[PDB]
Amino acid sequence: EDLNFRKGDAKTDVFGSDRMLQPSPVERIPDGPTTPEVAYQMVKDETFAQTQPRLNLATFVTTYMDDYATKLMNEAININYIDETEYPRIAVMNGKCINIVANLWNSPEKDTWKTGALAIGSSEACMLGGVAAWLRWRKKRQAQGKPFDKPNFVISTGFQVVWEKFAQLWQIEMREVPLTLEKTTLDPEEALKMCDENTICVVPIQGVTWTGLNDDVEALDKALDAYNAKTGYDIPIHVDAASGGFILPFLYPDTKWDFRLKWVLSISVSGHKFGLVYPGLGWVCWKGKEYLPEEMSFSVNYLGANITQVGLNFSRPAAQILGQYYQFIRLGFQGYKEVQYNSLQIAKYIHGEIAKMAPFVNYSENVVNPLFIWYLKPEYAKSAKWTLYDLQDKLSQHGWMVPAYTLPSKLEDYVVMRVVVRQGFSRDMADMLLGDIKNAIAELEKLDFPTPTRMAQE
Amino acid sequence: EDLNFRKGDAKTDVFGSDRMLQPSPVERIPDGPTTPEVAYQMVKDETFAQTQPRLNLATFVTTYMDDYATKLMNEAININYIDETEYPRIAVMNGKCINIVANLWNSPEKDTWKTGALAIGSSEACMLGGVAAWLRWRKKRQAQGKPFDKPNFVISTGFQVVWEKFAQLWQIEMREVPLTLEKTTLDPEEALKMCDENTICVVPIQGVTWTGLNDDVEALDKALDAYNAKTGYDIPIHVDAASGGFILPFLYPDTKWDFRLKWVLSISVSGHKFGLVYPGLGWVCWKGKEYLPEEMSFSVNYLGANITQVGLNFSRPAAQILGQYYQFIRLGFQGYKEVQYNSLQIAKYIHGEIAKMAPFVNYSENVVNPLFIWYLKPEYAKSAKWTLYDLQDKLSQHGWMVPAYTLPSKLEDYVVMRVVVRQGFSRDMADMLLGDIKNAIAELEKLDFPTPTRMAQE
Amino acid sequence: EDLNFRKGDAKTDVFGSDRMLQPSPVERIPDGPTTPEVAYQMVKDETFAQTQPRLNLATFVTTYMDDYATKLMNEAININYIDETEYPRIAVMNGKCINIVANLWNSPEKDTWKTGALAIGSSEACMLGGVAAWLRWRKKRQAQGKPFDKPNFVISTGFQVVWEKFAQLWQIEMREVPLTLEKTTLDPEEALKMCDENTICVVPIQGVTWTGLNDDVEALDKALDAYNAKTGYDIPIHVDAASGGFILPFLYPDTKWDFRLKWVLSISVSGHKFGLVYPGLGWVCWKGKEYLPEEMSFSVNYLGANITQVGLNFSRPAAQILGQYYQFIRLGFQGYKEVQYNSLQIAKYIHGEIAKMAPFVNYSENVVNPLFIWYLKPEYAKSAKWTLYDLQDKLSQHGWMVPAYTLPSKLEDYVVMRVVVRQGFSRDMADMLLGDIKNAIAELEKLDFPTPTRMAQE
Amino acid sequence: MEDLNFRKGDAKTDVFGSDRMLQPSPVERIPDGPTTPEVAYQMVKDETFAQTQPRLNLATFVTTYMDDYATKLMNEAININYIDETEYPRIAVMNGKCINIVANLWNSPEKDTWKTGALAIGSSEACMLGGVAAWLRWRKKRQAQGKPFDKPNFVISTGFQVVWEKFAQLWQIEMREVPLTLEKTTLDPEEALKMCDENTICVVPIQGVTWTGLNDDVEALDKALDAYNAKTGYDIPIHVDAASGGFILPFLYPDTKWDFRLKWVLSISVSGHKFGLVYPGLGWVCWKGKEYLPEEMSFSVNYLGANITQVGLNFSRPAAQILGQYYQFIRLGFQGYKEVQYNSLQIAKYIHGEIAKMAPFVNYSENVVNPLFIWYLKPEYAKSAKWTLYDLQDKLSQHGWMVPAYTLPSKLEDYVVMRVVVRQGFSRDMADMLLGDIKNAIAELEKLDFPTPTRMAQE
């Protein structure tokens, strides 16, 4: 007999121990240690009772990479990117990713080492673009003898929350252009009506999270050129291309949205969305070195490479740089094109099957990013006992997360549902989702009384 | 450009391929092959959208073993148990497991190699016990000149479905003794009312699936001894101990339920329930060689071990034998006792926490197996808008399976919910479950209208 | 110095401990636990001193799958198939496998979800087929006013033992048709002579274990059609296709043996033999819903799939279902055909090389399954000092298991040896086997006195 | 027989008998076409060989070792995006529990069970959140007072880590720097108070100054600040940059009053990936109470009954580091952290003592409070030596070490120093290897007949 079996010795079974009769620590660090197997289970087991990543259809962020990328990134788990003197090959590799992304967006910059920065996501990449737009505007207004204490920026009401963070954390006024059924993306005319001498940039979005659509950057650029010629305000574009920045170059090469446009001075993207890398990657590029203020930035030479030093974070994992560069080499342009082709084709397939179901109507007939939204047919909704929130709950019973929500300004009465198709979500998985949607519809149509969310609508 | 990238060559990305734009085969084998990576994802990805095993609280069957048992079993995946001449060490190992189980049940058999058999689960083990009881009875009645064409057996209405399978597949009449609030387990007096000259055995259950309770085997044995003495019918007991066979020896050693009893001639158990082995293990033991008919069985000597050859299956995985022997050596009696103690303590803990909640009342104050059932307070239920089926659905939205069902005959008006606590379900996971139950109750109590199942009860 | 080193603490070396100076438990569970490393070695080390599976040439059961199938099945070790409500995707996958198998056997059933059942092997699949035949016959005779208490079935003496198990466990009389050199497979005329008003089915075998041959199912169907027309007895066929069920559709598609035949009402197969899945898989299909008695079976709808619930086992591993579906997708029809082609070609190669050896003659000139048997030339055997049993022992000295045995009734004086070629047994391994056979012959021919088995024959 | 496409990348291709491995890696543009996974794996992996191995990187404060279970747990969460809190609410709650544990390690008096704090990628984001909150609290006060709020400043030692310069640049807030001297080797409160005025949003003492390894005296700053605020009414607060010391002081110096026990310490930040013992990607910031986190910055959402404050500069990010932190808290507990930090500090103290015995070297401080320290050349030795600490850095790099040499901040900029950081996973045995290499390097450099470039640059 083993005296200390329950206390945690070499013979203890994890689930025959005193520790696994005790709660996990909520407030205070435990006084003493446990065995690695026990602590492993205590943390691991708490992650079971939630959505499985591959069935999270709310997220845009990568939930699958192949086994070689995964092994490569796991092996770099202890590499701190910012130690560039210690890890100069990764610093160079980061710069090469920046070059490749800038050239994917048709940068006219002549320098071999393109002007850009690594980010943890589009959040940091967006904030860097906006701070740069803010600093360029401050300098221009100062040289003109004009005030520079009340900056603002203009964006669709379909903005993603990081722009609200930017507005709050830097105390910059956000001006929002509302969505309507007639103007389902940012209308250039209405955005310009909200511009003045204090506007630091307009932010069109490629891959609006609420709708899956693309603001027309080319139409914005054309309108802005006329407006800037008339006012002299010299207002630029920063493209929030979080999703579309890794869709448009491969599937829509002739759509002019990027550094080909006169007024697009910076672009940001989520490398961990359709850049196909696990969580923790974003990129921001500037059209040239003259658009990244010296106040924000400096550059260091590593093994002949000019790597710009700009960022909100400092120490950070380096694994995502290896993952991105691996994808660029493993897939190339052709491979990126076929993977995004698959994701868009599957999104289009689900869109078409949803349109055939009696309760549903799609927000758009045009699927340009691998995601889309739909709502209840207005005539169907009036007499239905259920809402899209009830459908979300039914789908959750089978492990899916398919989110229902209200649309932004002036469409807020529309409850919609969104499906995002990422690499690793196949046609076969689409059929499973659609089968569960049909069954969920059949069960909810048997209801004799309205649900809580249905009553709230009336 | 790689011409065959989409068709499946060395450069193909699984989710940039034509195969992952196609549905999985429903009716016919595909005409041609795919890459192993593609096929692996196609099969694997279908298993995502269902209950995760460690959150499956309906099942009694093991969903966790430690890393060494798991590795041992994985390494034996290609070992066919039934090739005993080729794998005689595993045949002997099977015999040693049988000895250990039979002695765990206090067999008085003097032979070193105890009379018992390997099974895939309690289904086969129960059927073998029942077939043996049927053949012993047939032989007795024929020798007595009595008819033997209408056998029956007696069991609680809380029987598990394999006994209905046995009745159907062998055409033996099942006689069911009803459950009542007054007699919540098999009452011996009522069981004897259903015994006659054609009864081949009575089947008390240790670990009734519907209720979590134990039939009183000792009381049945006493009643049966008096009955057999007056009638000469010689009716035996077969104990269905699917769960309790690996609980009672460790936590209730002095409960006289096994071969210590005169009329207990066979006992069956699920090695994959509380025997702590992954799916695919059951055991059946007989009290002595004389209770296993020669018509059913023979034995072969492997390396000096006498291994009885009886079974419904033939070729089968051998991994579960290695797993069982590992558990016996790894844990021993003390280790089994500590693991089952934990599971029972967590079940009692949840049992006590459930009783404190306003909507609930427990079916029993006595928790003798690591599971229990509760129902709605009758006064609460009459005015509640929801039923336990609604609570089951709410819990499923967080990944749990906690089943609601109506109890067997004469308690069929009771809708109950059951929680089973297995090795690998910790106190921390119990708190997560109870927190989700509390949140679910709060949500259901906001309903203004009754649910479909609530209306169905009126 | 570490006081508890020998007792099993964190510093203990497995083979410097007291436990590894002690024998493994034969009769009783050890009182206390050990470390997982110690227990892992104690169980693992016992499996060393026996036949290695890839050198087991006696077994028909899969001993190799590729790395992806193996990982997929290992990852499902804790999934209990029978929890279909909890794991409905695996329940649907099971049904898809059944559809594919039935269509491989040319089922005319129009229902999308074909009538069949999952099994642990051909044992359960055969018994389910046999019980269904018994129940259909019982119902017919009852409707006719005829007795139904003495059923029989007809089979070759080349039956595999599960049919004797079936006869014993259900008390159904087995009538055996003898083998002769003139009639080396089931002779239909002799089979029909054993049919009467009490015959529930005739069982032809595809892949007779003793001989490697195929009973002629079509010839049986023809004779049975005329017999049923003249008697009205309506006697069916159940095909035991344990091996051939996954050989004939790919290599002999035009051989009429399956549901193309009028009287073939059910077929069984071992998915773990030439279905190419590790141990634990069988399938049985019925020609239509009307041939599966309602007394035996019911069906449940899972996500729109009609899954029949019939079986002898209940809880069981689900891994083998994933493995079967993986093989269907990974290989397709072409892939199955190429693997079985390789296995048959290697068997034919070994067959041709055996025929060139002076002591040996093949039982059949035609190799139709990836296995065959041979015996000693009668003139050579008479003056030889050794038998095939001695050759089996010599081969065992190099790790092979190549079994020698006497053939069934009327051929019982023929001692034969069998080789089975499974996936993972290459031409290179065949050359190693043949080299060991030649060397073994050379050694045995040096004997000056006869061996015990040679003396036993005289 | 021959395989026609062997060099082009087919099923038989050997990575290093292929055309692709005769070609350079892409510098400018994405390749037109794909390669096999093995080829791409080697092309990226092989570029990482020719640089410092993490466990020999003695410049970094950031974790380079966790045990196998923490590593496995974090690897298994590589595809979990923390910010999807509705989808992953158990990790959201787990994040909140980590924040609670950290806040209580720092003796927070907050009575709410769900402490006011935020997850970060490192001390950079946590420090900026602390500063933005200080900036916003100061703005709100001056606004209510009718006073101007358009020229904020903050006060910090010249030993600041670069993220505070980023904060100054990216938010256009004036950084006021207090110089270091041999007489005042850490932040002196009196000199700091001379740089405070009505526009100062906070003072930032540092626990674990990167340049020196020392701790600013927060308690002495708190006392001086209390007197100043009582006189002026400016209400200037403390934010402690405790990137390293935040996970040393509670375990090894529990009685040092540096945290929320102090009146004016309203927020504290730390790097979980330094001495919190988690791989790269973790920082934490806590506030002394909910009232010190402006609602303008923040909101909170209830997940499974837990109140999780939503504040941050990042959005989507790996969740693995949260599981790693919670694993370490449970696996080690208070005792386990104390023993690991004890080991790291003891080995730093050991190297410190052995460095002192060597003829060329003198230590900057006799007191080692964090598992790191700096030394420089003895002044009399330096004048006649032909080499500098940069030469010793280069020599050690030849054996794979990174041991950094650099000039100290303002008023000590003439001091070339070298720093050694001891992290979990750097043992006594490895310290013996480093010291043996240091001795051998000294012997070789003393053989020089002429000065090196960096020695001449000093003249």
Ligand SMILES: *Cc1c(COP(=O)(O)O)cnc(C)c1O
């Ligand atoms: C994803 C998203 C963001 C935020 O980017 P993260 O990568 O989550 O930090 C910003 N804008 C848009 C349009 C987005 O889709």
Ligand SMILES: *Cc1c(COP(=O)(O)O)cnc(C)c1O
């Ligand atoms: C589990 C169960 C059975 C069926 O056993 P399996 O292991 O699923 O084959 C029979 N009886 C009882 C009491 C059970 O709990």
Ligand SMILES: *Cc1c(COP(=O)(O)O)cnc(C)c1O
């Ligand atoms: C294998 C075999 C059986 C028994 O099947 P298992 O898969 O071992 O259960 C029955 N019939 C034949 C012809 C066989 O080869």
Ligand SMILES: *Cc1c(COP(=O)(O)O)cnc(C)c1O
């Ligand atoms: C590390 C460090 C920083 C920067 O923190 P990161 O975790 O690298 O972002 C800021 N202040 C101090 C004192 C530091 O040591």
